[PDB]
């Protein structure tokens, strides 16, 4: 609660890095084939935001390990010479230059 309007400022901040919102929502086997099979914990923007209303982050820390772990799968799924992959390496790096 003393880091909910803190973690709405980082979340805000960092889907402003996203204007296409490739990140807003939790991505599907039909828009993603096998996305399920090869990724473990999948996490979006729309599912962080609930997080942060339903006061699920105890600590700065486990919100940016779910901002961490969101980019962190889609390097994992989108191969490199993609426009996801490379979205999630500039706006991972650039997400934790701010919270850091």
Not at 24 to 45: L, R
Not at 71 to 74: E, G, S
């Given at each position: 609660?003393?880091?909910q309007?803190?973690?709405?400022?980082?979340?805000?901040?960092?889907q402003?890095?996203?204007p296409?919102?490739?990140?807003?929502?939790?991505?599907?086997?039909?828009?993603?084939?096998?996305?399920?099979?090869?990724?473990?914990?999948?996490?979006?923007?729309?599912?962080?935001?609930?997080?942060?209303?339903?006061?699920?982050?105890?600590?700065?820390?486990?919100?940016?390990?779910?901002?961490?772990?969101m980019?962190?799968?889609?390097m994992?799924?989108?191969?490199?010479?993609?426009?996801?992959?490379?979205?999630?390496?500039?706006?991972?790096?650039?997400?934790?230059?701010?919270?850091?």
């Open positions: 609660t003393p880091i309007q803190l973690l709405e400022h980082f979340l805000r901040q960092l402003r890095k996203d296409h919102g490739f990140f807003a929502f939790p991505v599907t086997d039909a828009i993603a084939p096998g996305y399920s099979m090869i990724i473990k914990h999948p996490m979006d923007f729309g599912t962080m935001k609930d997080k942060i209303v339903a006061n699920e982050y105890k600590s700065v820390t486990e919100f940016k390990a779910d901002f961490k772990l980019c962190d799968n889609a994992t799924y989108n191969r490199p010479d993609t426009v996801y992959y490379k979205l999630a390496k500039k706006i991972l790096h650039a997400g934790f230059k701010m919270m850091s």
